[PDB]
């Protein structure tokens, strides 16, 4: 097949997939029991199977996004009830997978490490959705270590911060995390946070920032 340099699709993917999906919709989040995990898996594989692992689009996962009806706690959404707490996020967490043109299965030999691959594209899409589903007061944890804690070039300032619905979400709250080691100055007064700030305000939303240890 196509030779790659990156790790292969996680051995036993489908099982690990359905297994996690079942534990989620049936016991952890019982209000989602009516979600068909087989259907969800198939709709997932369709996004990349029989395709080049470096030619995956955001549209390949669109159906997946339409299929899953996610339960969303309002004031608990937190960017960085996290994304890994949603059905899809809890499933693909730490898993690898890709396809191959010359097959209708998943590549267990090797996968890419080419910015439009199965893995990278999946997380971007479910992140955008997650944002769109946010309700009330949304949070976001920012690294107080970095110079520019907030940077558009991230999935956050790129699409996440712009996919937040003002009608449902009325306030964005940025958490600038710091270490006891280091005189981490108040980054909430820097530009990155002043920009992230204007963006949110310019979108009829209240912005709050805090510096914690």
Structural class: alpha/beta
Give the name of the CATH superfamily of the largest domain.
Answer: ADP Ribosyl Cyclase, Chain A, domain 1
CATH topology of the largest domain: ADP Ribosyl Cyclase, Chain A, domain 1
The overall number of domains is 2
- Measured between the Cα atoms of the first and last residue, the distance is 50 Å
Topology order in helix (H) and strand (E) letters: HHHEHHEHEHE
Give the class-level CATH name of the largest domain.
Answer: Mainly Alpha
| Cα-based radius of gyration, to the nearest Å | 19 Å
The total count of helices amounts to: 7
Largest sheet: 4 strands, parallel
Task: Please state the oligomeric state of the protein chains shown.
Answer: monomer
Return the CATH architecture of the largest domain. Answer: Up-down Bundle
Instruction: Give the spatial strand order of the biggest sheet.
Output: 1-2-3-4
As a percent range, the share of strand residues is 5-15%
PDB class: hydrolase
Keywords: hydrolase, cell sueface antigen, Structural Genomics, nppsfa, National Project on Protein Structural and Functional Analyses, RIKEN Structural Genomics/Proteomics Initiative, rsgi
Assembly: monomeric
Entry title: Crystal structure of the truncated extracellular domain of mouse CD38
